[PDB]
């Protein structure tokens, strides 16, 4: 608050203007990073009420639909597994400025993408989203990695088991 200092300081540029350019940089990054999750779905796709996803019990990666926090269970873990004085920082003269988007908004988009992918063929990335049974959608992926698409269906239960188990092991592992 020193007046006399504030007079002596009348000799230089207001260089924290340039800091603010980084800050909006960060904000547009925070958009850009997930514009595919955001902008490339201007359609906010909801998950369907149906859950007949070929036996692939991926429930825990969806938003927890009952909860106020619309995060996934796993997202809720992740949010807690990060170890998340600011009021002193403020009065000392240093100020955080809040995110442009809340984690609820962000998680709503993440939900939108989980939904789009599972509900629909990847043409939703081309905007012309199309429904498709999830099994078919995976069979094309196998053909994409040069495995003949009969092999998925011939073993679909085994894949679904393996998948569910692996997701299991992940969220177990995310306990530490």
């Amino acid at each position: 608050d020193s007046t006399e200092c504030s007079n002596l300081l009348l000799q230089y540029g207001s260089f924290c203007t340039q800091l603010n350019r980084a800050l909006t940089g960060i904000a547009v990054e925070q958009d850009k990073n997930t514009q595919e999750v955001f902008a490339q779905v201007k359609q906010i796709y909801k998950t369907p009420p149906i859950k007949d996803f070929g036996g692939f019990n991926f429930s825990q990666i969806l938003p927890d639909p009952s909860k106020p926090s619309k995060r996934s269970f796993i997202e809720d873990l992740l949010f807690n597994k990060v170890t998340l004085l600011i009021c002193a920082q403020k009065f000392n003269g240093l100020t955080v400025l809040p995110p442009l988007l809340t984690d609820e908004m962000i998680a709503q988009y993440t939900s939108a993408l989980l939904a789009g992918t599972i509900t629909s063929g990847w043409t939703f990335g081309a905007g012309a989203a199309l429904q498709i049974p999830f099994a078919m959608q995976m069979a094309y992926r196998f053909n994409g990695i040069g495995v003949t698409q009969n092999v998925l269906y011939e073993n679909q239960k085994l894949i679904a088991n393996q998948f569910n188990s692996a997701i299991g092991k992940i969220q177990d592992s995310l306990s530490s």
Binding site: K46, I50, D52, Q131
Partner: protein, 50 residues
């Protein structure tokens, strides 16, 4: 106002139902990139000193 995230809807998923496109349109679209700044230089004995 509290901004809207987008347009809410849902894809009509079902364990048997496909959609396939019919008529199509060629998008033409522009993407833009910078390739150089302007080249500059500073003799200290002009800038720092006259």
């Amino acid at each position: 106002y509290t901004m809207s995230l987008g347009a809410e809807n849902s894809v009509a998923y079902s364990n048997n139902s496909i959609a396939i496109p019919t008529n199509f349109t060629i998008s033409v679209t522009t993407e833009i990139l910078p390739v150089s700044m302007t080249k500059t230089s500073v003799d200290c004995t002009m800038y720092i000193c006259g």
